[PDB]
């Protein structure tokens, strides 16, 4: 719908698979039971990632008021 294709168009891109859903912990643990470091490295990277963006603030700029207060 976004890309502007009709369902039965052969030139429709098929870039995605049915597996791309919210698999559980265990389902991912078995998908990669050959690479356990890969699972463990998610927990590790999650710990490294700690952002605190600005919330609840305000920022006015100013104005050419001479030597006078903004108030005044």
């Amino acid at each position: 719908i976004h890309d502007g294709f009709t369902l039965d168009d052969p030139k429709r891109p098929r870039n995605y698979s049915p597996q791309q859903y919210m698999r559980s912990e265990e389902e991912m643990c078995e998908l990669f039971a050959d690479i356990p470091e890969a699972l463990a490295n998610t927990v590790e990277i999650a710990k490294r990632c700690n952002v605190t963006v600005r919330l609840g603030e305000y920022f006015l700029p100013q104005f050419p008021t001479g030597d006078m207060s903004t108030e005044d």
């Binding site: 690479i35 470091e37 463990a40 490295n41 590790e44 990277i45 710990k47 490294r48 700690n50 952002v51 605190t52």
Partner: protein
């Protein structure tokens, strides 16, 4: 050898057995051999054994008094059987027509088994549904699709639709075939969160927990 049928009936039962309480009024069938119309059509009218359905009446005009002197299914049982036996039966919604057909056969009390035991039962609607999935595959739909006149045809009733379905059938089973083709553990690094990162983590979780009242990391 391909045998085309279209059966006009005294309406249907909408609940339970679609054949219970109903009988056949008209049989209009055309013979199609090597995709050509021979003209050896089976067109008979039958005994109603009941009232013609108001719906069916509006479809192509049929009154009970017209089908009174006309013979019953018993008079043309063998005749119609031999006409279709050992051939292809192309039908619209096979469950409906076959149900009526076998129903009449059992009414004769000649122990007659279902037509599917001695004949190849094929619905053309199912073919159209496979070709055009989720599209209207009605006779008039396909008629318009394959460029056909259904308005200037003298045959009113079964034989009309049979002829039309034959042209649709040819259109679907054209044009051209396709070519059969298709056809250890090792190491690898774990990066442990630094003390700086751990502190940021702790502080970030503090915020979640203090504001939200929960922590699953920690639940």
């Amino acid at each position: 050898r391909q045998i085309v049928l279209d059966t006009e009936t005294t309406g249907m039962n909408q609940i339970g057995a679609h054949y219970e309480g109903h009988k056949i009024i008209e049989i209009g069938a055309v013979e199609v051999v090597n995709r050509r119309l021979t003209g050896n059509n089976f067109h008979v009218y039958l005994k109603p054994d009941r009232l013609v359905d108001p719906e069916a009446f509006g479809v192509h005009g049929i009154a009970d008094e017209f089908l009174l002197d006309k013979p019953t299914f018993a008079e043309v049982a063998d005749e119609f059987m031999d006409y279709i036996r050992g051939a292809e039966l192309v039908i619209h919604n096979a469950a409906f027509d076959i149900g009526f057909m076998d129903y009449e056969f059992s009414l004769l009390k000649r122990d007659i088994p279902k037509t599917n035991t001695f004949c190849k039962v094929t619905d053309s609607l199912a073919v159209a549904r496979k070709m055009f999935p989720g599209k209207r595959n009605s006779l008039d739909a396909l008629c318009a699709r394959y460029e056909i006149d259904n308005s200037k045809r003298t045959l009113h009733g079964a034989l009309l639709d049979a002829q039309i379905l034959a042209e649709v059938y040819l259109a679907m089973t054209g044009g051209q075939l396709s070519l059969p083709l298709a056809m250890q553990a090792s190491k690898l690094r774990v990066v442990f969160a630094t003390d700086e990162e751990i502190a940021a983590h702790e502080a970030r979780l503090d915020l979640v927990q203090k504001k939200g009242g929960s922590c699953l990391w920690r639940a």
